[PDB]
Amino acid sequence: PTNSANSAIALRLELLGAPVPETDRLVAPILARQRELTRRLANRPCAADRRIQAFLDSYLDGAAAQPKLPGATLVLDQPGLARALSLPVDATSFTSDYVESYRVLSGVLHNPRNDRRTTAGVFHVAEGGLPIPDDKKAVPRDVFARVLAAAVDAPDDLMTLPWASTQADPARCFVSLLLRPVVVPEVPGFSAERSMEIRFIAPGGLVSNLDFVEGIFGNGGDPYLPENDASLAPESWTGHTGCVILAPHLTRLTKKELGLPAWEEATERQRRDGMCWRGADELYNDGKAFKLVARDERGVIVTIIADNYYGYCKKEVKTQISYSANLFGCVEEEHSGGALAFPRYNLGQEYTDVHTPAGATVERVLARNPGRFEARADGSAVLLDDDGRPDEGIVLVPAGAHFSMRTQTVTWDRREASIPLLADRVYIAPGGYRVHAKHREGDATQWHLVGTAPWATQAHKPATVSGGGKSEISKSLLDAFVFGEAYVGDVDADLDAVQKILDPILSERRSLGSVIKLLTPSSMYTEEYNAFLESIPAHIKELIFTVKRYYQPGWGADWRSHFSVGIINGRKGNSLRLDGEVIKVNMLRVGFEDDGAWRLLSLRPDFSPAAKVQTEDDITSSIVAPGGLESTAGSSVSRKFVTNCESLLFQRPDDAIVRGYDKQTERDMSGTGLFISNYQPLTPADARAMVADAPGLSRFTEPMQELVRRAAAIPEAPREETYWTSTANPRLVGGAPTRNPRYLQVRPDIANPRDVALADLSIHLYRDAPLAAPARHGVDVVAAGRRNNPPEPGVPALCAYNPLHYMELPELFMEFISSMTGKSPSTTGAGSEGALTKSPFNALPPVYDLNAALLSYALGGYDGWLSSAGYIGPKVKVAHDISLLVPEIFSRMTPQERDARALIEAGYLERLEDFDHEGRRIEASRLGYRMNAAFATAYFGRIFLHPDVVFTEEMLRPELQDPAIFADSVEVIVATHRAVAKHYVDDGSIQWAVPPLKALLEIMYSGRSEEGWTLSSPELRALFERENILASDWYAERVDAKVERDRKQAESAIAALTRFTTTQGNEEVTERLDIEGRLASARAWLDEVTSPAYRAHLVGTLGLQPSLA
Amino acid sequence: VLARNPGRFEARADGSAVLLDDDGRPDEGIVLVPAGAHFSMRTQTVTWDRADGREASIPLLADRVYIAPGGYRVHAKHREGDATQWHLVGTAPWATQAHKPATVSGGGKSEISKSLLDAFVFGEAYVG
């Protein structure tokens, strides 16, 4: 429906009175009637813009101007219009000084004037509002007023809708969009999802930007309807309203003309910020992109962006969401990744279920879910379609069922039943454990069974600097597999030695896993028996498990003759062969040696990557709920729940420049319907050229080749040329390929909804809860990541960390406050992405974020883990090889096992302590605890086959690589803590930090708290304990501020509902929407928020910053 | 207790825990409770305070045995003289083992293990 879209467009422009040039066009002449009954109403702004203008006029009362939001906007009331507006009605390309745009085979492509985001000096904040953070630029209120006035007077080129840009009289208007981005997640017994409202306003030239945000955050509809006025559905809003105005022309204005002072009359701060001029011609922000924010406690945040690169739009929603979170209480916005992981197993050819707990049975499942299943005569059952017919894709089977790839059947007795075992099905037992068949990861011709356990673990990866691998938590481990060989030293000796050990091991009703348990030292084996296991060399065990995996009944004790090594050029070979074919085993790389050689480590032959379902990526909303509720039934401590605010993810495929390497990107970008940016627009001629380069073509994955061939198959041309994009061809900037190629990827839980459905189903069954009930999951483990680097000329050492550190809360928060990186070092230490990595996306005093975060860890009893990315010590490169293992390790440990206290009591974590180096105290105690060789032996044995060679001694103890550098890294850490803490001292923020953080900041800055404490003072450490917080006045003061905010908003809701129900001529809308049924709920709510039961249900939540009540 | 016995218990949200069956399912007959727990036959509940101030509360029932973390047990029973009056019984865990050897007939060798409850007499509280 294309003319469908152009009609919708023509129609709306006509209603706005904008210029215009087929069956539907004729049935709209009663537009021309209502047009002469519209000029009896004056232009009244929507409910959202009314709230925005009220703030702006109050805020700039008696300033140099009180500008007006544009009133004549083309309103994008439906999804899909904005894309259709982005290209000329009659052409496939468009060009302005602001954007080059193209219709491409894979969707739409937009290359903006600037191809990347900046953060240095970009974030500006206006005086007259809440306090400015020390790290931002301070802008006088009069200057803000003038920049806002310039922003609503945009030039004609910029205002020209691309869609009508080729017509005689091109339409020129502001376009605008209502968003309702999520800020408060849903938690079943606890919280309704709530959202703020944002109004995106932009010159018609930049309608691509609206398309951009609408795909990520959804279309909120027509703001002028009371269905979509936020105040009227208070139960689901935060009380807060944001505005974003795109205005790239503002980088032409001078500092003088906006009323900034000359250098001589300027404060030291104004001179630090460049908010003064030595020359009349000095451009504002030196002509570079910026954003200018105004806000205060009233709940309205107004941002102007002087650039149209799509990133800034995304990150301004973020910022505004973060603003709303800070004023709502109880919630946080975070910059974080995450995934819900279910351990998996390679069950071989033959497997009997042994993980259904007694009590769990087909009958009980069926009884708990009336009408969801179709019970079968044999004992199995199948789910029903939403339309009442059975779906054969998912088969519930009895406890103790047996699965056989030899017979291709699932069997059980009760009278033996038997159903087909088929590749396109998933078989699930009554406690939620799944079984399915798949081809081996390296080989489409070999197949085996996979078990998925239902006791998932949800990882959360916050506050992780760039390079730290935030996205890696949810990335797939299967793409990292390397396929190596089974090692043989001397084939006669080794196989003889395998023989001896086999004397029942090759019995077909003894699994591969049990054999591994058999031959792994355990503390419930005779101490003689373990010494025997230690006598078995590493490679002989691997050879046994390999023999086990491939053993056939048919060979019956003459297995030996099926195994060999080749004689390669007269030398006995080192790879075990099965009937002459080299056997292939799965490995992962774990970092690199000093000279850059790969370290490869055999995975266990019963390991399969955990199944992950992404829970977070970049913009995250989170709430902390107390324990003992519906959604926290098994927890004494608070729990954290999350929701991803974005439906599409703005990816930068750095790796896809190399052909064939990034399989996921190449697949996605060969699809359709995508928003694409910073790629080179290619033509069918370019495709024909690339086809004819047969070597180059053959390096693409198949999806991208089909795309190259579709484009090659298109007969030629002018303004209807066909365009396409290639992963190998990012946009040329300065005749070199850009390093910021981009596309909006469909969130992988939305793209693969069967994976979600299966996870949910396993959870319900594991909990014995009905499918009708929601079964929310909260966060189990927090594992942040760090970018570590070796020192270099002009790059400070930051490589003290081993693979995995645990940090108690004070040390954790030094890390979080600092968010340190080797990129952009300061005068005294390292670069900082600011509190929680959110300095570029936080318009408020960062202490509000910090107070909340702290409470979340302490009240939730969450151990702070830190994984290592980049380098471990100066010499060992790791890339993200450890980032990827995190969820696999924690998800295969019980909560009791992975508790930090338990690991310290068993000797699996080792504390770091201060020491002297060249007579200076090195404060290595700030690095917390770290894993040691015993942790590797105890637990990495659940992924890898030789857990003792996984990490070298130098990897576990990076100080052995070079003790000088280790001490240099810790000094860099301490200097960087100081420089960061100084921000809180200079702006007075330190006074608003909660006691444990105030002290922590004081120590970071000067060495001692105000009371004289240091990091090891028991009094300071006691302020971070869960019990002392819950007892404190300051925590009670936050709970009470939250009650008081909620009360005022419930009063502001009652006042808004009434005024509407008693405005002239609103009676028919008032009954249709059951508004007085809402006003009764709003009246019952006010009573509830003031009641004591409500104050008590808030104990164990984050509360609110009292100054913001 | 829980940490010294991995996999033997099922920890509860309220702070209590219960032993697991030979077959992996919880046995409600024995309830581990926190140090400082309060036991009330009037409310028929075991209560204790939480750091958050909520006050936890489980049923106090005659067919159960409640045990604190150092091994001291609490259960309910009818008075020895009267099936209609009930009270709580504490059992301390610091036992003493007696041994009664080389005791001639009439010396009461078996008496060491015989029940003292059968010897109770029920008298009155004296008022002058």
Ligand SMILES: [Co+2]
């Ligand atoms: Co980001």
